[PDB]
Ligand binder design. Structure first.
Ligand SMILES: CCOC(=O)c1cnc2c(C#N)cccc2c1N
Lengths: 156, 39
């Protein structure tokens, strides 16, 4: 299948037409998405098969063909870009200064951008183009608007 | 049975649409990986 670095849509035909369930990153031969997109299922790339390798329902992360490779972190200061890939719509950068999820276990970057559920797995970037985490696991606030965690994995 | 299609390069795009705010939220993460608002 296609192994070129970049961002990819995650599609299914198990519903009406071809439905975009999410997004992911291909880097160093490994496909990175959120767990709730695939539920740990195998993926097709044309005629190639992608088999799950690592995943964790609590982090809501999964990798295919190898271990999680993305280890860049939000610096806690600078603005970031969501490389949103919405269903039926072209890849679009959205620049934002992340807010903060304060948890008993520490602080996490968060982006206040509302996109459709099928946008889950779209990467968040820094100034140098490196992926600092993925969009699509967050909360709905007093208003009714969505805030996503900047969800990042560990590189072993 | 899920499949992938390439959607773009991963590049920072100088002068892209700047938007969204920066809220500080108290949250809890349960064992199912669901975030909730503590209050
Ligand atoms: C569908 C069930 O409700 C949710 O938990 C849930 C709600 N909204 C989103 C958004 C938005 N907007 C983006 C990405 C993931 C979600 C999302 N998982």
């Amino acid at each position: 299948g296609e192994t070129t670095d970049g961002v990819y849509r995650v599609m299914t035909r198990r519903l009406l037409g071809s439905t975009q369930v999410g997004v992911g990153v291909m880097q160093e031969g490994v496909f990175h998405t959120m767990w709730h997109v695939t539920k740990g299922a195998a993926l097709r790339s044309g005629e190639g098969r992608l088999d799950p390798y690592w995943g964790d329902v609590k982090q809501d992360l999964v990798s295919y063909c190898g271990p999680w490779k993305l280890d860049a972190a939000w610096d806690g200061l600078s603005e970031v870009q969501l490389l949103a890939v919405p269903p039926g719509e072209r890849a679009k950068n959205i620049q934002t200064l992340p807010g903060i999820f304060k948890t008993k276990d520490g602080d996490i970057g968060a982006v206040a951008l509302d996109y459709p559920a099928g946008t889950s797995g779209s990467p968040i970037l820094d100034k140098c183009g490196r992926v600092i985490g993925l969009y699509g696991n967050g909360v709905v606030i007093k208003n009714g608007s969505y805030v996503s965690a900047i969800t990042q994995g560990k590189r072993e | 049975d899920m499949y992938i299609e390439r959607a773009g390069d991963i590049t920072w795009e100088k002068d892209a649409e700047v938007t969204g705010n920066s809220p500080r939220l108290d949250v809890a993460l349960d064992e199912s990986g669901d975030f909730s608002l503590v209050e």
